Amino acid sequence: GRSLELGAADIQDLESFEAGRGALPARAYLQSDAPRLSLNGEWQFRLSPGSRVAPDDGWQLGEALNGFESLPVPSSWPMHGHGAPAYTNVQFPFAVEPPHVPEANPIGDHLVVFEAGPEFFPHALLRFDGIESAGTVWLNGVELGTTRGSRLAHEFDVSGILEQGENTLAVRVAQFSAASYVEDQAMWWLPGIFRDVTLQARPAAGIDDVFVHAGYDHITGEGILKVEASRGGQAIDAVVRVPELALELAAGTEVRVPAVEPWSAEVPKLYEAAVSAAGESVALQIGFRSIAIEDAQFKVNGRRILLRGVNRHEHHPRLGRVVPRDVVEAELRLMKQHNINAIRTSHYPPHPQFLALADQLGFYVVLECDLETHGFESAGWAQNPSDDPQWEDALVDRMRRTVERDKNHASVVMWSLGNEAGTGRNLAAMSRWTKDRDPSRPIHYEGDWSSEHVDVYSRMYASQAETALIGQGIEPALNDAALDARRRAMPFVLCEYVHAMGNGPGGMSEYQALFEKYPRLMGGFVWEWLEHGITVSTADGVDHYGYGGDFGEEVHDGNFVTDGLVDADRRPRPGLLDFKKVIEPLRIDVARDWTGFTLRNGQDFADTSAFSFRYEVEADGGALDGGTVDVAPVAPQSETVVELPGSVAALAAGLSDGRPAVLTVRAVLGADSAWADAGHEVAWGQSVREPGAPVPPAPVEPVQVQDSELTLGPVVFSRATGMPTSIGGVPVEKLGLTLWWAPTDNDLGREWGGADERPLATQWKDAGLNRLHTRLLGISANPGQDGGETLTVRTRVSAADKQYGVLVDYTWSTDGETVGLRTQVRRDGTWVNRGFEVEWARIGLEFVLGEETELVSWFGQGPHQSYPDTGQGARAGWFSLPLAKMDVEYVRPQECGARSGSRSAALQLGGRTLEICGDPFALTVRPYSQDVLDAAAHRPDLKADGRTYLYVDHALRGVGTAACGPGVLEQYRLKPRDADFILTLKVRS
Amino acid sequence: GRSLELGAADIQDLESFEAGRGALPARAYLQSDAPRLSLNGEWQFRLSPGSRVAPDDGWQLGEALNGFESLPVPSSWPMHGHGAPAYTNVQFPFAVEPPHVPEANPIGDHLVVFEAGPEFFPHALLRFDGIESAGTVWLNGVELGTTRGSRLAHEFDVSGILEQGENTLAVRVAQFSAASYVEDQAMWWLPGIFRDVTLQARPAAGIDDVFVHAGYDHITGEGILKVEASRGGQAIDAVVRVPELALELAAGTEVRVPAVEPWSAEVPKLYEAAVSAAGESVALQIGFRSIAIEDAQFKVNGRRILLRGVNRHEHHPRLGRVVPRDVVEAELRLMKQHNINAIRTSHYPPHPQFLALADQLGFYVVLECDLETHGFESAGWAQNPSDDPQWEDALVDRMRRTVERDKNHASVVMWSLGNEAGTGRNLAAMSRWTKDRDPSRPIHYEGDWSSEHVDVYSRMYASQAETALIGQGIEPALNDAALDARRRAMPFVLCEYVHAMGNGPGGMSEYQALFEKYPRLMGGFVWEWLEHGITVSTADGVDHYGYGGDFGEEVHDGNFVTDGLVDADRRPRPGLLDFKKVIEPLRIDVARDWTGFTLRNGQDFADTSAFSFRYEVEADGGALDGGTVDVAPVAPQSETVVELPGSVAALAAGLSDGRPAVLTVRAVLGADSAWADAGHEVAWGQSVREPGAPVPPAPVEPVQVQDSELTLGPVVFSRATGMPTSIGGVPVEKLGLTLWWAPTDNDLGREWGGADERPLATQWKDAGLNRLHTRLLGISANPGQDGGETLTVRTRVSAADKQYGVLVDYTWSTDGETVGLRTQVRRDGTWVNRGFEVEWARIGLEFVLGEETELVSWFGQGPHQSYPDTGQGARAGWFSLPLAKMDVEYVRPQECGARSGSRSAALQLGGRTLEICGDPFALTVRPYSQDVLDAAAHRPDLKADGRTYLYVDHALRGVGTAACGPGVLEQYRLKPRDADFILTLKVRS
């Protein structure tokens, strides 16, 4: 009675704890003059549901094709119809029982035929830069070996197997393997041969590996150069020549270059280099820079740096893991254009080509190993591979391949062991290995807060408050004295902070102020650069992004995959516009009297010589004056006071009091850079001469009384409801108090702290703020001027089954041309529900107008949105936008589009224009209601009903980052209070 | 500057705390020989959204009609297109700020013209038996008065206003008023003139009110009769004659009748009576019964009674509050047919005609005042009308009208102050008033547990455990000694228990055993009699019931309105079938050896003389023997041992051992009653000779091996999955372990107790029991008999992201004809999730068959469903049903249809029959999956996919009553364990 189950052999392999077999030693990615054929293109492809039904029908030989169809390689095959993508955050999509794999395991058989010329004989290899998750490779029917480490390179010798003429490469890829357990990143599950496949000749007397060592002596200005070269693992004779520095030297010997221009993210100086053997030459780019930890500060080339970073995942809306080069270059430019200078490769090594672009454009790169076991946390870390001895060789291998591939690039300033893999022996082994191999780069890892085997203390999403304690060196001690002394001598980095999901992130300014002032604080990497949205079309042809659950997942985490500063197509979100301003490398403080501005050079190495300093004075009627001022270069971390031309300040005093005028000073690129054109804005500051409060109009018009209607100048009232039915010509369907907004993504996250951990959204629903009703208490006229009179309308607003409420009194007035509106809000009972105090989203007014708005203009902060704890990038000025462009295209619709700090506004309804003025208020205009906004799950759910929903707010709440990390900060919370505010309305034409 | 708001006058009235104005004194509902014209029929109707827009256009005069359309009176107008019904449980549908009302307040103007003949002059009145919630009445343009108390009667004098010839009655009804705050029952909000409107002549020398006093002296057998009669509030001369007792006496004098036949729910003896004045005579039905509380026992006519009760709401699927008389009679018969003997009029007085039917058919009635302020609880009872002095006159009035209307009916044995209105002064005033007016009926009220102003200690939904402590008189003491001594001397009643929502109720037997054994325990009233479903049709024409939220409610409580023993059309639910058995008034215990049966008379007054005692012996081939046995009448609360004919026991021994046979003894009506025909079943008992366990077939067939398939006799296997693909002819698409069922309504209720209060449904979702996956571990043959061999298939079942699981081993065998299946379940890790132990719905198997089942037959318990803590009414026998009739039509689909205690089963798939045998297992067969069941919100969502989903269970969980009250009891819980069970399969034809 033997065993009868099928495919037991393949499964035994997939469940193996060993690293792949049969591969050549891990080595660096090198630009080589050796022959090379890329096998990329259209391959043939067969998909099987599982190992047990995967045919064993000699398909490796590539003849008598059965069931194979065309597929482009590289690819993430679920992006091409085969199966579907699937997204989970923490959770695994399969039963947690390592190393085992589920029966439903997509198996993808790949096959391609290619011609091998004589230049690839006698010796050659095949190189796979990435296969998710488990590869088995055959060449002409013979097994080469297997691959483990989905984002790591593998090379297989094909000497004596490759044959002159055509050849048949066959690759079986399984989605799930034992390696899946250690690749649980928060992202889509996407199997396939998703990176370059290459045939490379390996001539005799060639160069297999090279290790560049380019240090900088910031005292003397010397460069410290040693370039190791090896073959088959042994050091070899080779000459390395760098023409610009006039050097010819032998590999393996360290020399001292008298003077070098150091490399930095700010000034990425690179020297072209070649290291040559008789049979092969490899070309290099050398950046001289030394990394050191000193006095609890992370220093480069002798200077503490500030990391302005983002977390970079590799994703493409239509192609999955495959990110085309032109997209990589574009997004890296876009980062530079937004003052970013650092990248964490969350949480696996990137495409090999990435590293050279980083060297060239200038980023401080945290290079992270492909390791994460986060789904074990929910079980108390039981069975965690990070501390299971059987997993040691697999994890050491992952780190080795990571380090070896990218070790020659000046842009890599930290090696990271992985992400959210807990604590354990194997993580210590990975660190010990790295410290031995490359002592030149400090080691990062957040998972072990004791920081026992790292060189920098890292955390994710620590509050502004805890960050400030750490900055001062007074955080709580570890229980072990020896470890505590060590950790307090380490600088501190936030490897993930200010979670950028939906509307937000809020609180960026408070983190940034701490980064300045506290040297120990290295900076932070925003989570994250890009939304992982997957494009999906409908019959009519409109496009929207799909998120967790939109692809039939049984187990998923919704829209958490869409949590980035740009959308999947790299279109900015407002968060990115704000982030740019927060991390601006120059500070510009315009003097109130407009005689000049304080300039502080926030850069770490460069001066101000690359910048042109320009000023403009703008008024309602357009620009009044402008020019450019000369600024002696300001050294790093230094500052001076720059005078402006006297004509500017003379113009300030000449303004009739009450007239609005904005002075803007901008720091712009004087010349084209490799990442932007001349005229690109880097930093800016403003001084505003505000317009005085608008005069309340004289109440000289009387209220004429009719049976069902009241009229007071241009505004008609319903005598039953007491609210306006029209103002001027434009009809009004509803007017009421607002206290609620359609929850943001942050509003849906849990409010950790106290006995109340309900999401703010849930607190609102329970309290009933979404379902407010208003009761009329009375309508009354009162004596005004010269026979005229005011109209007062008293209401009380509350919710069903609730006793608490607010008294709302509207007192109206008009002189015939402009309407005067005063609003008074009074608390009635105690605003408590289910034992906890109710907070408000806002204190404002909803105008539901009976006609559509084609265009919205305002004086205030813009062009893009701004909420109390955001809008850093919204500047003062005059703005005008079509209605569609007022909105923000978040993948899940939610509260957005508010323009805080508005002094005046103009809506254009057909041939009529509604003006709104008064003390600072927030502006929002939409073609749909709040209820349909909150109900919508995707953009297509948003329907214009033919109305205008106008929102005027006397107060707003913050947005925070409660989806992950701190909620709204104290100073931006909005607890129930009493309030009063005045507005003025007008209809012209 | 005066006030300009509209409709302030009407609103001032609606917000009044006073009882209606202008009405005649509250008095009894009386059958009178005075002329009378019912105004019921088609009236004219105009609906306005609110008071402020309700026209004041002299519509009362009934001429120049504008906007009026036909409407039948009585009615609940939202049931007739105008507006829509709306259901909330606790919560009010409007802002809680008494006495105020919302702006959105439907106002219904009603108008009818009628002819008044000379017989209605000089004096007459108009009578309204119910207007929800605020009436204003005009006759010929003059205001008569207003009404408050939606379920209470009101009478208005029309002398000098009524005119000979035609007359125009006009009634404005507002849905919401100050009275709404005190009418917050859990039910639909349905305004309208929903009860009879009548014109009654009031001749001179007539009789306005009458108060019958008919006591019984259980020692002597005497009746104690005094019939009061009055006019204009003063006692008057009148003769009262009762022909059957040969009595002629003057009203106002108490006499002693030598012998009377007492009245009870069991024997509702009624004596026809008339009390006559010169101008008017009123006919009466007198039931002689005395009510008394003695030795902490609620006694009638000297004997402690047992209340077998239901809570009766008034509802009709298409007509709302209007319940047609033929429906009332039908449902009251249906109650009697299910052994019910008591009714609580939850929570308002019923239609006046109700009381006579109760007197006639025989129910102990708890008559409840129209009062409930339950929506104030969530605010700590702040602003509760029950303790607000301004509400005293309105609430005293409610009680007065309640008592006065129904005070002549022997069926009313308790007056109840209302329901869930908290505690306060006005409730004490209502009690003081009642105790003064009618000392003959003890007072009920649950809201005040101290029981300071009541005569019985009442509770709702107290656990079986607390009920048992109360039964023994050892419950915790009140802090006040004086009140505690009082309360411990009171008998105890559950005014609501065993909540009958969805599948259930469970735990009825445990309550009932306590009711026996503990005299102090009065019994209980099930919540509730009927589901409040509202019929709603679709284009294709199918009907389904609507529940909270299906009618566009902004605020609602879902399907809680559907929580009854019958559906809105009085079709029984399984709960009713079980309840009948639990409260059966006779106990029948058949002897194992079939020589006789123990008979215990559980009745309180009657003997067994009304019953015929019949026996039958049933076998697989039909009935074997039957007859009827003579039983000397058994006295109340007594018992005897009845012998059966010797042929029965001789037949028992003659059965070949292993053959199944069922002896059933039934107590049936020997003669027609007023509530059922002769042959109606009241009680029953059984003794079963079980069929021995089925022999496992000899494993003499070998397993033949092929590439993709395995065969072992009639069963074909997939060699990849290891599961059967067919058995005999019938295809099998899936076979797996089950641990989960589609949550019941109870499963959705919170598990009060411990730090885990997540509904069991939520505990399951978090633990992943709904999303199980199975992994194949191995397939193996093993030596059997005479060359044959078994097939063992090892699997492990778990869920994604979870580590805990069960090992499932299937060992198969066959001798060619019948298949032998053994299943072994082993716990792997610890079954804990989010810090709490996971429980299971079931341990069973899902067979997904590739063909439809036309008919399902089984030997076991039936015909209807049965779960571990239900199925009391499922009896042993042989049953056969079409597939559709296996299912249960709960309004929200949910787990149902299981037949526990099954020994054998037969599914008929086309021309083939699948037999299943083995140790006791539960049977369920459905044409749709569990996922579509759990997904469905209404019956139309259930779609047959063309398959058969068969469920065989070795263990089930209870269902409990966690939707409101106790969850599943300890003994019926199902914690994770190891398990083993055997089955035998066969396909014939």
Numbering used by the authors:
A (entry chain A), B (entry chain A): 22 to 1010
Mind quoting what the paper says about this structure?
Psychrophilic β-d-galactosidase from Arthrobacter sp.
The mutation of the residue involved in the stabilization of galactosyl moiety within active site, D207, diminished the enzyme’s activity. Results of the TSA (thermofluor shift assay) of ArthβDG_D207A did not exhibit significant differences compared with ones obtained for wild-type protein ArthβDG. In the case of mutant ArthβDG_D207A, where a larger side chain was substituted with alanine residue, the change in active site size and shape was introduced. Especially surprising was the gravity of mutation of D207 to alanine, which is part of Domain 1.
